[PDB]
């Protein structure tokens, strides 16, 4: 039967409409908040870099500079020239690149040989040259400071201070996206962290930010038969469940669970203190929308049958309750439903082998991101709380540099909506469109992202305004909240998994406990890989390897098991900083002041363990990298897809005759399309190999020495694939 | 039934060329996706239409129809004819090298 989602994804002019006014008032003075445009400032710094290349040629001091920063300069110049559309300007870059080549070929014969092996491999040789620690050396900004001897504008200074960590941050849109996508490939040893003069810098979040600022404002349009748009009739609760008082098994919080001769549960959920009937009716109709479209959506959770929604006198409720006794009035609207007992076992429960846990976790993350494509967001899967935790917090505020201290982490996923059955209790839904518009949800929890960017550094006494690149996020804030929802889903998974781990390893064989925690590490990475596949289509196997290029599975295993169980509290403060080196192999130890509560660990309330010191980072650092790796792989793959298709039309207009140009250019239009294919995605290069052969049909005239080799390796790879395909 | 290796390939190709999300892939686009998968037909105007466009369930059924008609004697051949660089001179120890980095490994039976 038909199987598709009821949401179409597109783009819109601007997310910054009906937002709060861009103004920061403080000490009675209202300061306007102004955008520093990303691409405009970016281009100013690249032309300044270009002039600086020219003042380096005139200085005739190319020997004074190490051989592999003329390799960086030349390779970037060649890459930039290829990215340039019109011939007149790409020749003014090759003007600048030729003295660097003349010198390298004459005074550095070996480096010249290595560089040319890259120039015939790719049209953007700089992105593969920088698939390693070379990326941490900012050759562009170094040259700018040395030869552009004139002070930067207030915004080049702003752009520089924000994106100081790598020259890739100044690359034009295609070169940066291509570099960022391929920096997860198997040859690439790049990881966004370098060690400074004894200090360690992490800039995984900057990769995401520098990507997001080049994106266009997304927007989701819901089908007219969508759950939030289709006019639904009244609820026909024509039957009333007869509440016996011995059929009730249990009472899981304003919900009473009743037994049945069919070994499943009829549950009856009672009105909260502050709660309208609307909410319980929405939960009813959600359960029906799920049921109706369960095949249509390939939803895997066990879905409850909504039985009835009606009102019940509070006397009867309180009468049929005894044993563990948030209801308010003498009349209480009710939502009664039928569901397996799996629906009421929280996914973090000790009584699951890790065969059932993995199976049930896989169920949850599938329906979480399938329903996201469907356009439905569950913003309260867990109570990780105004002070509501932000998974991707450095991209949403100006101040924070790392992710905050999760408070009472085990209590957050306590009544998590994730069960052995799968997704559960889906009443508190939110339309995905609410994240891309100025809804009540967004201006409450994300008011800075929607107002935008005050800090004293930003303030310009001359102007009277506070200027920052942050205020640019007003036109794109929906894109930020989209990615944050993705990371938020996977962090609730992680706390749920860690909760299970703590309660299973407690009262246990040290090898048996350690082996459990590394399986928990694997199911977490497997979960993120699943998300990437549901969101992009990348084979989950490859999504996993792309992920493990960036996130260290084994570092994550050993900081999860160390911080989410209380054994470290029984250590004195200074055998503890002997153990931290084992879990932060190169990275700095996790510094913290707080006094440890014995048997608990770090605990502000002295009863419940937290993740992090009182006003510190969360100590789960490679978890933080995991989420950004996940979220960047998604958004990065989608931008690469867009640049792929944007260039795909170019080669198709040249091919058809709609754009006349030379032979030697039509082939480099096609070869450029090769560079925007996804990493590890073969059919994309099968498609451009087809374009290559058609171009040789169009231009038999043309010599093809520059692209024969790079397109042979695609041809030989495709031939080898199909002989391996003959496994019979 | 297809193999797991090529339903994965077909699933990603479908996901990539569906430019706006939900299975809303229009007949104008399916030419290029099959081109990316090794096909180049003339007339294909059937097999679900589902409104006038098709879902993935229809795609992965559309395909084995176009793959249960491939007389692959000329497909598996041509493939060997690539590495036969000179002509009709078959391959050698190199024909185990290539099969050791494209998509597979693990004990080829070099005959
Ligand atoms: Ca579509
Ligand atoms: Cl320099
Ligand atoms: Cl910013």
Swiss-Prot record, chain A:
Its cofactor is Mg(2+). The keyword Transferase applies. It comes from the Bacteria. Keywords: Hydrolase, Ligase, Magnesium, Metal-binding, Multifunctional enzyme, NAD, Nucleotide-binding, Protease, Thiol protease, Transferase, Virulence. Its EC number is 6.-.-.-. Disulfide bonds: none annotated. One of its GO terms (biological process) is proteolysis. GO terms for molecular function: cysteine-type peptidase activity; metal ion binding; nucleotide binding; protein-glutamic acid ligase activity, elongating; protein-glutamic acid ligase activity, initiating; transferase activity. The keyword Glycoprotein does not apply. Glutamylase that mediates the covalent attachment of glutamate moieties to SdeA on one of the catalytic residues that is required for its mono-ADP-ribosyltransferase activity. In turn, inhibits SdeA ubiquitinating activity. Also glutamylates related SdeB, SdeC and SidE. Glutamylase activity only occurs in the host since it requires host calmodulin. May also reverse the SdeA-mediated substrate ubiquitination by cleaving the phosphodiester bond that links phosphoribosylated ubiquitin to protein substrates via its deubiquitinase activity. Interacts with host calmodulin/CALM1; this interaction is required for glutamylase activity. This is Calmodulin-dependent glutamylase SidJ. It comes from Legionella pneumophila subsp. pneumophila (strain Philadelphia 1 / ATCC 33152 / DSM 7513). The gene is sidJ.
UniProtKB/Swiss-Prot annotation, chain B:
Residues 5-40, 41-76, 78-111 form the EF-hand domain. The modification N6-acetyllysine is found at residues 19, 92. (Microbial infection) Inactivated by S.flexneri OspC1 and OspC3 proteins, which specifically bind the apo-form of calmodulin, thereby preventing calcium-binding and activity. Ca(2+) 2 binds at residues 54, 56, 58, 60, 65. The modification Phosphotyrosine is found at residue 97. It is found in: Cytoplasm, Cytoskeleton, Spindle; Cytoplasm, Cytoskeleton, Spindle pole; Cytoplasm, Cytoskeleton, Microtubule organizing center, Centrosome; Cell projection, Cilium, Flagellum. It comes from the Eukaryota. Ca(2+) 1 binds at residues 18, 20, 22, 24, 29. Its main location: cytoplasm. There is a cross-link at residue 19 (Glycyl lysine isopeptide (Lys-Gly) (interchain with G-Cter in ubiquitin)). GO terms for cellular component: calcium channel complex; calyx of Held; catalytic complex; centrosome; cytoplasm; cytosol; extracellular region; myelin sheath. Changing residue 87 to L: In LQT14; significantly decreased of KCNN2 calcium-activated potassium channel activity; not changed KCNN2 expression; not changed KCNN2 location at membrane; decreased thermal stability in presence of calcium ions; decreased interaction with RYR2. Ca(2+) 3 binds at residues 91, 93, 95, 97, 102. Ubiquitination results in a strongly decreased activity. Phosphorylation results in a decreased activity. GO terms for biological process: autophagosome membrane docking; calcineurin-mediated signaling; cellular response to interferon-beta; cellular response to type II interferon; detection of calcium ion; G protein-coupled receptor signaling pathway; G2/M transition of mitotic cell cycle; long-term synaptic potentiation. GO terms for molecular function: adenylate cyclase activator activity; calcium channel inhibitor activity; calcium channel regulator activity; calcium ion binding; calcium-dependent protein binding; protein kinase binding; protein phosphatase activator activity; protein serine/threonine kinase activator activity. The modification Phosphoserine is found at residues 79, 99. The N-terminal and C-terminal lobes of CALM bind to the C-terminus of KCNQ1 in a clamp-like conformation. Binding of CALM C-terminus to KCNQ1 is calcium-independent but is essential for assembly of the structure. Binding of CALM N-terminus to KCNQ1 is calcium-dependent and regulates electrophysiological activity of the channel. The C-lobe interacts with KCNN4 channels in a calcium-independent manner, whereas the N-lobe interacts with the S4-S5 linker of KCNN4 in a calcium-dependent manner playing a role as calcium sensor and gating the channel. It is linked to Ventricular tachycardia, catecholaminergic polymorphic, 4: An arrhythmogenic disorder characterized by stress-induced, bidirectional ventricular tachycardia that may degenerate into cardiac arrest and cause sudden death. Patients present with recurrent syncope, seizures, or sudden death after physical activity or emotional stress. CPVT4 inheritance is autosomal dominant. Belongs to the calmodulin family. This is Calmodulin-1.
């Amino acid at each position: 039967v038909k199987q598709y989602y009821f949401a179409r994804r597109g783009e819109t002019s601007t997310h910054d409409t009906s937002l709060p006014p861009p103004v920061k008032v403080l000490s009675g003075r209202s300061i306007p908040l102004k955008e520093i445009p990303f691409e405009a400032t970016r281009n100013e710094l690249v032309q300044i870099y270009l002039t600086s290349i020219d003042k380096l040629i005139k200085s005739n001091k190319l020997n004074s500079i190490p051989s592999q920063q003329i390799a960086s300069h030349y390779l970037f110049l060649r890459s930039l020239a290829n990215s340039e559309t019109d011939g007149i300007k790409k020749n003014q870059i090759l003007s600048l690149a030729k003295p660097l080549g003349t010198y390298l070929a004459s005074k550095e014969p070996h480096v010249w040989k290595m560089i040319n092996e890259l120039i015939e491999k790719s049209e953007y040789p700089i992105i593969h040259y920088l698939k390693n620690n070379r990326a941490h050396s900012n050759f562009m900004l170094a040259l700018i400071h040395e030869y552009h001897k004139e002070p930067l504008t207030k915004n080049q200074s702003a752009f520089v201070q924000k994106f100081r960590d790598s020259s890739v941050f100044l690359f034009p849109n295609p070169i940066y996206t291509a570099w960022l996508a391929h920096s997860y490939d198997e040859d690439s040893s790049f990881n966004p962290m370098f060690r400074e003069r004894l200090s360690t810098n992490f800039y995984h979040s900057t990769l995401t930010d520098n990507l997001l600022l080049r994106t266009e404002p997304k927007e989701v349009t819901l089908s007219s038969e969508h759950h939030y748009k289709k006019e639904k009739g009244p609820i026909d609760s024509s039957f009333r469940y007869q509440m016996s008082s011995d059929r009730l098994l249990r009472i899981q919080g304003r919900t009473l669970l009743f037994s049945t001769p069919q070994n499943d549960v009829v549950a009856v959920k009672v009105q909260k203190k502050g709660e309208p009937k609307s909410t319980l009716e929405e939960e009813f109709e959600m359960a029906d929308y799920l049921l109706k479209h369960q095949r249509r959506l390939d939803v895997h959770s066990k879905l409850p049958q909504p039985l009835g929604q009606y009102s019940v006198k509070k006397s009867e409720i309180l009468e049929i309750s005894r044993g563990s006794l948030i209801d308010d009035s003498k009349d209480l609207e009710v939502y009664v439903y039928k569901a397996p007992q799996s629906y009421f076992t929280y996914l973090h429960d000790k009584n699951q082998d890790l065969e059932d846990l993995t199976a049930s976790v896989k169920t949850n993350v599938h329906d979480l991101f399938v329903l996201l494509r469907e356009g439905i967001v569950f913003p309260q899967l867990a109570d990780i709380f105004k002070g509501r935790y932000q998974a991707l917090v450095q991209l949403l505020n100006v101040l924070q540099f790392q992710l905050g201290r999760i408070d009472k982490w085990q209590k957050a996923v306590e009544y998590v909506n994730l069960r052995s059955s799968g997704l559960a209790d889906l009443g508190d839904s939110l339309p995905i469109t609410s994240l891309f518009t100025s809804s009540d949800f967004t201006k409450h929890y994300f008011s800075e992202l929607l107002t935008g960017g005050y800090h004293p550094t930003f303030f310009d006494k001359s102007s009277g305004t506070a200027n920052s690149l942050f205020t640019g996020k007003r036109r794109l804030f929906g894109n930020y909240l989209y990615l944050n929802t993705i990371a938020e889903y996977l962090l609730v998974i992680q706390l749920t998994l860690g909760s299970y781990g703590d309660k299973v390893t407690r009262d246990m064989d040290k090898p048996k406990k350690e082996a459990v925690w590394r399986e928990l590490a694997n199911v977490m990475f497997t979960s993120c890989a699943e998300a990437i596949h549901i969101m992009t289509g990348i084979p989950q196997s490859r999504a996993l390897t792309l992920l493990k290029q960036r996130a260290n599975i084994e570092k994550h295993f050993r900081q999860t098991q160390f911080w989410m169980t209380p054994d470290y509290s029984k250590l004195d403060e200074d055998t503890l900083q002997m153990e931290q080196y084992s879990i932060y192999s190169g990275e700095p130890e996790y510094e913290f002041t707080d006094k440890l509560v014995s048997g608990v660990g770090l605990s502000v309330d002295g009863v419940h363990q937290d993740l992090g010191g009182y006003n510190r980072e969360s100590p789960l650092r490679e978890l933080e990298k995991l989420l950004y790796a996940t979220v960047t792989l998604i958004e990065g793959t989608m931008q690469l897809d867009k640049e792929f298709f944007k260039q795909l039309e170019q080669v198709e207009k040249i091919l058809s005759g709609e754009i006349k140009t030379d032979a030697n250019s039509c082939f480099e239009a096609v070869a450029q399309l090769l560079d925007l294919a996804r990493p590890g995605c073969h059919f994309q290069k099968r498609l451009v190999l087809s374009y290559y052969e058609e171009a040789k049909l169009k231009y038999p005239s043309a010599p093809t020495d520059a692209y024969d080799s790079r397109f042979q390796v695609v041809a030989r790879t495709n031939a080898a694939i199909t002989i391996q395909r003959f496994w019979r | 039934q297809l193999t797991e290796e090529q339903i994965a390939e077909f699933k990603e190709a479908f996901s990539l060329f569906d430019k706006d999300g939900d299975g809303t892939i229009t007949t104008k686009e399916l030419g290029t996706v099959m081109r990316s998968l090794g096909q180049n037909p003339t007339e294909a105007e059937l097999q679900d239409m589902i409104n006038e466009v098709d879902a993935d369930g229809n795609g992965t059924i559309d395909f084995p129809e176009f793959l249960t008609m491939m007389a692959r004697k000329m497909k598996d051949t041509d493939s060997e004819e690539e590495i036969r660089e000179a002509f009709r001179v078959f391959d050698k120890d190199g024909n185990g090298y290539i099969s050791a980095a494209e998509l597979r490994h693990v004990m080829t039976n070099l005959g």
